[PDB]
Amino acid sequence: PPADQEKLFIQKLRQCCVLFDFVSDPLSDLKWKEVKRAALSEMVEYITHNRNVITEPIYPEVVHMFAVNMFRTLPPEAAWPHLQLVYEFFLRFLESPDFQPNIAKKYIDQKFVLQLLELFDSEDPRERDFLKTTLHRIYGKFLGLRAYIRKQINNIFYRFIYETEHHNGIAELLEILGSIINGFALPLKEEHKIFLLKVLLPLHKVKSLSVYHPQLAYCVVQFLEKDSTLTEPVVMALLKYWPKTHSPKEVMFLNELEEILDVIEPSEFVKIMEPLFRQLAKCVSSPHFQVAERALYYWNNEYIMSLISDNAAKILPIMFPSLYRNSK
Amino acid sequence: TELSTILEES
């Protein structure tokens, strides 16, 4: 009945929107940073454990407090203790069982998720981890934003492939998409298939592939476990984007290629087995021992030897030409 | 943080 408990919550949220920086007096600055850090810690534990505290007027105050503190200009950081508490408070706000997306959708709009994506270019890996979790939760709770979030993530990827070729959050964004792909509907819609062929595959061309390669490979494998039909244009694309210059970079392609073979269908294997083992034979005879060791590890794979024993008439003449011939 | 699966459609 009395809004004293709700009014104090709104007071402390609005108090955290004061970007004061006292300067001049160092003691007053430390006192201000303390009371803001204390208020944030108080609200974090309050919203996590107390029940029925997220009332309807609380929603616009939380989103405003997050926007005033987080949506800033990225430096080219000593204020991280405050930033981390705001990420934690917002995450506990989204994860609360009392959180109602029907109310927060009025304030978690497209303009909000756009400014949230701009923060993924932060150089701080701790910040990108909080952004990764935050956007993953917004996607899963706001169906009216899922189409927009997928569209804007692609715009960041198209710019990263054909323009700037510089973005520090490529790995975190790909980690989010891996959970969306794992839940894709039965007949993969055309939007998702165009995303695989024209976004995920061209991501192997960028020079900085070594930074987001584990995440990129996971999205490619999950696409083939949903629809095995896409195995042929994926494998042929990796062979196209394969580093013709023998370098340690092609060890990453060998890992992605075995992870694909672990989920490939037999009927889909025979359609690309010849061009694949022709590249694989080039790796087992490569001057770089590190890439030959990784290729020779394919024989240790139990499932891969089964596909070779079933296609020995065509695969063996390619791997060991001095010992096996072929004909009609 | 491994991120749980997000179902496209129920």
Cα A172 vs. chain centroid, distance in angstroms? 4
Helix runs in A142-270, H state only:
143-162, 170-181, 190-195, 209-226, 231-240, 250-261, 266-269
Query: What stretch of H or E contains B2?
Result: none
| Chain A residues closer than 8 Å to B3 by CB | 132-133, 136, 175-176, 178-179
Chain A residues contacting B via beta carbons under 8 Å? 129, 132-133, 136, 139-140, 146, 175-176, 178-180, 182-185
Between CA A324 and CA A315 the distance in angstroms is 9
Give every CB contact of residue A109 below 8 A, 6+ residues apart in sequence: none
Tokens of A91: 């995450």
**Structural method:** X-ray
Number of domain units in chain A: 1
3-state secondary structure of A270: coil
Domain interval for residue A193? 1-324
Query: What stretch of H or E contains A224?
Result: helix A209-226
The CATH number linked to A82 is: 1.25.10.10
Specify the length of chain B in residues.
10
Residue A181's nearest CA partner among A223, A230, A237 is A223
Q: What resolution in angstrom units was achieved for this structure? A: 2.8
Between CA A32 and CA A24 the distance in angstroms is 13
Across the interface, which of B1, B6, B9 has its CB nearest the CB of A140?
A: B6
Across the interface, which of A146, A175, A185 has its CB nearest the CB of B3?
A: A175
